[PDB]
Design a binder for this molecule. Structure first.
Ligand SMILES: *[C@@H]1O[C@H](CO)[C@@H](O[C@@H]2O[C@H](CO)[C@@H](O)[C@H](O)[C@H]2NC(C)=O)[C@H](O)[C@H]1NC(C)=O
Ligand SMILES: *[C@@H]1O[C@H](CO)[C@@H](O)[C@H](O[C@@H]2O[C@@H](C)[C@@H](O)[C@@H](O)[C@@H]2O)[C@H]1NC(C)=O
Ligand SMILES: CC(=O)N[C@H]1[C@@H](OCc2ccccc2)O[C@H](CO)[C@H](O)[C@@H]1O
Ligand SMILES: CC(=O)N[C@@H]1[C@@H](O)[C@H](O)[C@@H](CO)O[C@H]1O
Ligand SMILES: OC[C@H]1O[C@@H](O)[C@H](O)[C@@H](O)[C@H]1O
Lengths: 247, 261
């Protein structure tokens, strides 16, 4: 499996991991005018999951199962235990981590659900190397007080970073500055709109690259930038891949 | 899902020096020419796109006025284009008449410059941002070894230095004409060599040239589509303090870039 370890966790190794994660996810991707790969859709459940290993500073490893259709965590394994999101595809338990003791977590893999169960938002949750390491630890032992927040950390540092070069670069900046950060409007506006940006880019084929609806992406000065077309570098050199939406 | 086939969209079109595409004096007569003008909320800078490949302001269709190059682009009655294929907009913001291959061009940078249909040479003066938001996008440009492009030698050269958040010369303004401009001196543009003997990318006064037209591609290169080449760290060595134009190849990571805004 593709993996990242605390033994060798640098700006370079993080970048390589995210780079290869995008590659695996975009196998068999379709492409439009924008030339941003669109993820696979209608994937048979047997091939719908991509396994990624993360290893903490205790050399204990979790394996996360990423759904290749939407780049979200469906489940994870730690040793002989596994844990499924409440909205994982129902047949997934017959395909992944079958030789383990399977549990269903009390919430969905969306930020909205995780924040409600965690009682804590992405805006208040620091990201960085220690928080990455700590989250793998909390998931490995499955300490329920920390599971939700650990997912906020890892969904963002792995999946949102994969989805967006701007987010990858925030993490790189924290790694080599050794300085934690909490996501601001720039980062959260990206996370929030990945699906809408997918729909609009794909819909824009019929309107010369112009969107049906404008999307507000914030810059690092907290100014909103209306992206109503594919002609914005903050979108088209940022979003690494899209959710399938339109034929 | 009706959202996959939107029926229209109204936006603005900006380009050379951040100026907007504007029907001169809001004149509705057929053949009323289109100009550069400072961007504003007026209806004669609102452009509606339709799935028939038309682009419309004041109820009439943007169009070339001749088969040959150098004539004004105008608005005209949309019924005259009844059988026409219309406008095609490239990935990089070239707006092309599909039949004649002429492209929307601004031969000067000043307000009230007439826009013309010309042969495409991929000049910056032929690059357009279709979009409601017309402002230059202030950013850092991150390259090899996670270093930042910096304007050096009194804003005449450019090379990689380690990123420092305060550092005024590590900031660039990406403009609607595909230019990459020094953030605290917006008359200066990142430019491909004007000397045949050199491949060195440098900083020069903006002139709308092919040399100053850059495209941030989804594959993470900074492409000059006129010279079919990309920005590259010389020898993949940041300590040479030289960024050059090269044909695209995955030899190292010297051709990979990030826009951090
Ligand atoms: C695109 O270019 C061609 C001109 O080269 C236009 O087609 C001509 O339009 C004129 C003016 O109405 C007609 O008299 C000619 O008969 C057309 N010639 C051809 C070759 O079709 C067309 O109008 C332009 N379209 C746009 C949207 O600019
Ligand atoms: C821009 O378009 C209008 C409409 O055709 C022209 O009249 C302009 O011509 C220029 O200005 C006129 C007033 C006259 O001086 C003429 O000889 C000029 O060339 C034209 N402007 C240009 C070409 O700069
Ligand atoms: C909005 C509009 O149509 N304006 C026209 C018109 O006038 C100008 C004006 C408005 C306020 C203060 C001074 C001038 O006519 C102008 C030509 O004289 C020009 O077409 C302008 O765009
Ligand atoms: C805890 C929670 O919000 N559960 C939701 C549920 O409402 C919805 O049926 C499901 C859709 O996949 O997503 C999850
Ligand atoms: O001088 C030209 C100007 O005329 C008026 C109009 O509001 C402007 O948009 C511009 O066309």
């Amino acid at each position: 499996n593709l993996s990242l370890s605390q033994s060798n966790f640098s700006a370079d190794t993080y970048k390589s991991f995210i780079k290869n994660l995008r590659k695996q996810l975009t196998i068999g991707a379709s492409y439009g005018s924008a030339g941003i790969p669109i993820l696979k859709h209608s994937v048979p459940i047997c091939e719908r999951f991509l396994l990624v290993d993360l290893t903490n500073g205790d050399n204990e490893t979790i394996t996360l199962a990423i759904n290749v259709e939407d780049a979200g965590f469906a489940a994870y394994r730690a040793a002989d235990r596994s844990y499924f999101f409440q909205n994982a595809p129902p047949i997934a338990s017959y395909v992944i981590f079958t030789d383990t003791n399977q549990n269903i977590m009390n919430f969905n893999n969306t930020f909205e659900s995780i924040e409600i169960v965690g009682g804590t938002t992405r805006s208040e949750t620091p990201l960085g190397i220690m928080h990455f390491e700590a989250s793998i630890f909390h998931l490995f032992v499955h300490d329920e007080n920390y599971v939700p927040t650990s997912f906020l950390v890892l969904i963002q540092m792995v999946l949102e970073a994969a989805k967006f070069k701007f987010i990858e670069q925030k993490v790189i900046h924290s790694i080599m500055d050794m300085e934690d950060f909490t996501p601001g409007l720039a980062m959260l506006s990206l996370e929030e709109n990945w699906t809408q940006l997918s729909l609009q880019l794909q819909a824009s084929e019929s309107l010369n690259g112009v969107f049906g609806d404008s999307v507000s992406l914030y810059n690092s000065m907290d100014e909103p930038i209306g992206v109503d077309s594919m002609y914005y570098p903050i979108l088209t050199a940022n979003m690494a891949f899209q959710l399938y939406q339109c034929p | 899902n009706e959202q996959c086939s939107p029926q229209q969209r109204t936006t603005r079109i900006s380009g050379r020096d951040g100026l907007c595409v504007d029907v001169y004096g809001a004149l509705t007569a057929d053949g009323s020419r289109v100009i550069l003008y400072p961007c504003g909320q007026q209806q004669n800078q609102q452009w509606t796109f339709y799935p028939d490949n038309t682009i419309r302001s004041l109820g009439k269709c943007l169009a070339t006025s001749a088969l040959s190059s150098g004539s004004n682009v105008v608005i005209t009655n949309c019924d005259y284009l009844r059988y026409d294929d219309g406008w095609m907009v490239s990935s990089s913001g070239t707006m092309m008449n599909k039949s004649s291959h002429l492209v929307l061009t601004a031969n000067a940078a000043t307000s009230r410059t007439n826009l013309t249909g010309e042969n495409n040479v991929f000049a910056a003066k032929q690059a357009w941002r279709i979009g409601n938001y017309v402002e230059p996008i202030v950013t850092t440009i991150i390259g090899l070894r996670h270093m930042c492009l910096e304007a050096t030698d009194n804003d005449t050269n450019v090379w990689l230095e380690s990123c420092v958040k305060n550092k005024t010369k590590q900031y660039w303004a990406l403009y609607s004409d595909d230019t990459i401009r020094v953030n605290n001196n917006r008359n200066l543009c990142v430019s491909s060599s004007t000397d045949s003997s050199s491949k060195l990318i440098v900083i020069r006064r903006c002139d709308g040239s092919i040399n100053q037209r850059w495209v941030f591609t989804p594959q993470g290169t900074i492409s000059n589509p006129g010279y079919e080449a990309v920005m590259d760290v010389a020898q993949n060595d940041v300590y040479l303090k030289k960024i050059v134009l090269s044909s695209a190849t995955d030899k190292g990571n010297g051709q990979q870039w990030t826009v951090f805004y």
